[PDB]
Design an enzyme around this catalytic site. Sequence first.
Site, PDB file in Angstrom:
ATOM      1  N   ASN A  54      15.648 -17.107   5.118  1.00 47.77           N
ATOM      2  CA  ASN A  54      14.696 -16.594   5.494  1.00 47.77           C
ATOM      3  C   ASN A  54      14.987 -15.594   6.558  1.00 47.77           C
ATOM      4  O   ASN A  54      15.771 -15.695   7.233  1.00 47.77           O
ATOM      5  CB  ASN A  54      13.391 -17.344   5.971  1.00 47.77           C
ATOM      6  N   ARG A  95      24.616 -12.231   7.197  1.00 46.74           N
ATOM      7  CA  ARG A  95      24.530 -13.369   8.090  1.00 46.74           C
ATOM      8  C   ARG A  95      25.257 -14.487   7.469  1.00 46.74           C
ATOM      9  O   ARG A  95      24.692 -15.303   6.644  1.00 46.74           O
ATOM     10  CB  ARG A  95      23.001 -13.661   8.045  1.00 46.74           C
ATOM     11  N   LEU A 113      19.102 -27.638   9.505  1.00 52.40           N
ATOM     12  CA  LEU A 113      18.180 -26.591   8.907  1.00 52.40           C
ATOM     13  C   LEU A 113      17.429 -27.032   7.982  1.00 52.40           C
ATOM     14  O   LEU A 113      16.699 -26.231   7.414  1.00 52.40           O
ATOM     15  CB  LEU A 113      19.147 -25.303   8.469  1.00 52.40           C
ATOM     16  N   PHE A 145      27.946 -23.229   8.032  1.00 49.37           N
ATOM     17  CA  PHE A 145      26.797 -23.484   8.336  1.00 49.37           C
ATOM     18  C   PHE A 145      25.902 -22.651   7.158  1.00 49.37           C
ATOM     19  O   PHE A 145      25.258 -23.590   6.626  1.00 49.37           O
ATOM     20  CB  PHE A 145      26.267 -22.992   9.589  1.00 49.37           C
ATOM     21  N   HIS A 161      14.801 -24.166   5.361  1.00 50.32           N
ATOM     22  CA  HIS A 161      15.450 -23.378   4.385  1.00 50.32           C
ATOM     23  C   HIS A 161      15.421 -24.209   3.249  1.00 50.32           C
ATOM     24  O   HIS A 161      15.974 -25.523   3.451  1.00 50.32           O
ATOM     25  CB  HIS A 161      16.628 -22.834   4.638  1.00 50.32           C
ATOM     26  N   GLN A 187      24.067 -16.005   4.518  1.00 54.76           N
ATOM     27  CA  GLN A 187      22.920 -15.559   3.812  1.00 54.76           C
ATOM     28  C   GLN A 187      23.084 -13.974   3.593  1.00 54.76           C
ATOM     29  O   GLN A 187      23.673 -13.304   4.372  1.00 54.76           O
ATOM     30  CB  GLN A 187      21.832 -15.599   4.989  1.00 54.76           C
ATOM     31  N   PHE A 227      21.051 -18.092   1.001  1.00 50.39           N
ATOM     32  CA  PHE A 227      22.072 -18.438   1.846  1.00 50.39           C
ATOM     33  C   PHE A 227      23.004 -19.667   0.962  1.00 50.39           C
ATOM     34  O   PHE A 227      22.359 -20.636   0.478  1.00 50.39           O
ATOM     35  CB  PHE A 227      21.575 -19.064   3.221  1.00 50.39           C
TER      36      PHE A 227
END
Lengths: 223, 264, 527, 48
Positions: free
Chosen positions: A171, A124, A187, A129, A191, A132, A178
């Site tokens: 998550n 991910r 975010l 951005f 997170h 993860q 991340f």
Amino acid sequence: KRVLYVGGLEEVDDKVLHAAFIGDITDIQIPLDYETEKHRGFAFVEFELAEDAAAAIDNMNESELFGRTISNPQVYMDIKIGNKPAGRIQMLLRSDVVPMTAENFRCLCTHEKGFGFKGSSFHRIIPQFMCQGGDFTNHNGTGGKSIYGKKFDDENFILKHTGPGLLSMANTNGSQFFLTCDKTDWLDGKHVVFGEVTEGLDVLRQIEAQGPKQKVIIADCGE
Amino acid sequence: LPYEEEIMRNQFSVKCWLRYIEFKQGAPKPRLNQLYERALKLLPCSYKLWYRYLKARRAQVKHRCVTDPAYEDVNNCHERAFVFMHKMPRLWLDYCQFLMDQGRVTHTRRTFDRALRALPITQHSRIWPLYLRFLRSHPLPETAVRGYRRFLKLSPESAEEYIEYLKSSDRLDEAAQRLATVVNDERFVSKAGKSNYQLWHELCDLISQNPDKVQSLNVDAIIRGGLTRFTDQLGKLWCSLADYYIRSGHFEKARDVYEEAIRT
Amino acid sequence: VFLDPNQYQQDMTNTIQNGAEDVYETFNIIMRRKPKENNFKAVLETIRNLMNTDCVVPDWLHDIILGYGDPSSAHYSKMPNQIATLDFNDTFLSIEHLKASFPGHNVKVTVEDPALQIPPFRITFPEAKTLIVEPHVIPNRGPYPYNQPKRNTIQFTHTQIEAIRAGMQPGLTMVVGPPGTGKTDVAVQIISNIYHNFPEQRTLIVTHSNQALNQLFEKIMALDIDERHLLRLGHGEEELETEKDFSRYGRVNYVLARRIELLEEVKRLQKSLGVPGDASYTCETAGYFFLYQVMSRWEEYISKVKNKGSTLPDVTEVSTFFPFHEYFANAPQPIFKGRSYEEDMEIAEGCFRHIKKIFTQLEEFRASELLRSGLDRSKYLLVKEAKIIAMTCTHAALKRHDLVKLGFKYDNILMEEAAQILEIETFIPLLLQNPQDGFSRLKRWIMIGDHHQLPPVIKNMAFQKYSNMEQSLFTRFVRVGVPTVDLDAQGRARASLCNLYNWRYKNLGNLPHVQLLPEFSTANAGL
Amino acid sequence: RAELMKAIDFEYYGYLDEDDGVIVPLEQEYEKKLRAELVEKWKAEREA
């Protein structure tokens, strides 16, 4: 000034490094061609002016009592994009802000819990951005397990992803973590940011540039 | 003391032995050396205990004059240290310093050669200038020519000290061949900023003042090679060539060397 | 191709001034020649290098080579540093032979017991004819049965023994051996006595014809000389020798195999003594293993036995306190027979002397371990390790540039068949080395030959007739007036054959112990 | 550079200085005078 900067000796080991220095108390060789030997006493710590360029497995290892060859735990993971290394992200996981997530990232790098970031991949990854990974069960961010079980709560969101190399617990935070290469204040509140790579920020930028089009996996990792 | 002796018998690391010798640091010297021998018989190859043993032994043996069985025990435990600490250059330096203290020459040369054998290639720089000091402390040059030959074989950028030694210990012919073979090389550092002119002038003056010693080289070819090498400072080399003919006894040849010294 | 540089410079200074045609631009026939005669350019290069180096010939040989002054100053009786003490292992077979083979000399034996009057002998050489002779014993070589090879069994004459006596002393000496006297046995006794008296000295042995060099080299295996100090470079190596080898690589690999075998013996001694460590030892670690585990165990062994004690130690005390009983299991048990204490101590000293022989051999092999390249190992073999070096004149003139390139040094020079060796072929192996720092390493110069024998192989009659270039240096040194050692008794031919050509030589007699054989008592059958 | 500084090393370990046999008695001859001078050198400072 009891620590050395012995280089020029990956085939070496801790016993072979400490056999020439034996009363060395600490001997932590880096993943590159460098090691540091520290003696507890004062007369035994002057090995730089006494056994310089010592033969270590048919190889000379020059020893200098300095810190040229190189609290919050640092997850030092050689994150490799594909079959080549994209850099050694020495992400200093912020134990002052989120100590549970920082210890989870440090243990995932050190692979002391049986699974973690040493050998896992980041499936991910977004452009500037988030990136993860750390999920060693499903390898997509949909698996993973923390120390308290499959899912664990975030420790604290005092830190923020305000720059490159900032690490957060992805998550609700299990084994997913991340790394952020830019501002991620949208975010925030979901997170918990638990790191800031003072070293390996270029490795985090390379991971963000590569992210997934390539298998970005830290095969070698540690504390 | 009995509990300390029992703890020293029960323990094995170097710190308990060092603490016991620091506790018993009086003048127990024969029983102290017996306890040293027992402790090093139980624990071999320990660098701190071996260095403390040789340091305390060399500090305590000083009442003996020149040749004693105590000094033979010091020498015997020096090679007993060198069984395992042959790769350690500090004990080799300590034995060579004690050998200049005693006054041995050929055994000091033998132990310097054994130190060169023991240290593979890396730690010869910690033992070689003490060998240069050993050869400078003795005015006979027959060992020192071969020793400085070995030093030039190892590190070739040290010929200036050899030239100074051969001009101080009157091996003038070998000084002339060594000067002539160092000044014509391309890469050489004299560590003085001579800019390749003071070496030429020193070679020319040394071969000019003493031509009877120099019976192998071609003097005129070397000085004419230097004169063709330079373009700005020819007068000193021309004076040196005719002064070579003056000390050779050729006044007409010195007049002729001055004649094309004028002409060229 | 390397062209002639002086002729090339003459051609360039000829073709640009006088306008002549260029020599090196019109060649059309290439000519090649056979080996062993294509070495004349190496001979001329050797001569040019000896001309360019000013002071190769020493002053004590200068007036002898030039023939000026007294011709008998090359004799050994006019020299102040004459060697007194000389060791003879197998030159003398018996004490009555030593008494009968020294004419004009009195023999003062230090012992009166004829049971201890056995070879080897040590003779101190100068009322003025007194020879202080003590018959000494060989050291014990260990518990191994085959540690002593075959020695010399030839009973030499008094002139042949006086030839060895002059050959052991430094200077020029000659052995004038007529065909029949057997000078090869005298030559190999000279080589064996030089090697046994001075094992650190290096002997060059030069013979022109390769068959006679192989015949001289074959007898060294039947003597008390170790084969690791032998070297024979050249194309005439092809003999009947069983282990072959004898080259630069050919003895360096034998040195490496001997080092491997002795390090295996060191590992076996380590497992016998129970020292910890399973990895293979180097030569430095073997020497320090000796100086820590063998020397200290021998020190506590002789302290517990107490050889330098108040009372006589027990015979069985040596057998109980010897720490190398399980090491010598390959030897025939028992190691100590228990007959006497000093005999058991002699066996223990033989075991320790064999152990010290192995350890000092590994200390010699330490320098071969210290050099990385095989060229450096062959250089170490050529300069330090090999003490016997067997050349021909042609190969010596070939490799004289390479010998001074590799820094070859020697101590004694021998030429065999000096009438078969030419005069420039005599002078070329004399000067293979050069003096460094005003020191000459040359002591002995031994000419074993016969000035009444043949001139060498010269393919032109006019040079060997008019110019007298077939006259050898041996014949020239005879004709100047240097005193010669003319051998008298002959020991391979019949006396009636010797009576036909004894007039050419100075009192060519007959050796009776060869002539009393059943082959010489009978005559030719059918005649 | 260990490989560059081990390009050539002959007679370096003291194995050819004793082959000529000229410096071996002379070193002991100077050693006897040096130790005989050091005996009286230490004797001059023993009682001082």
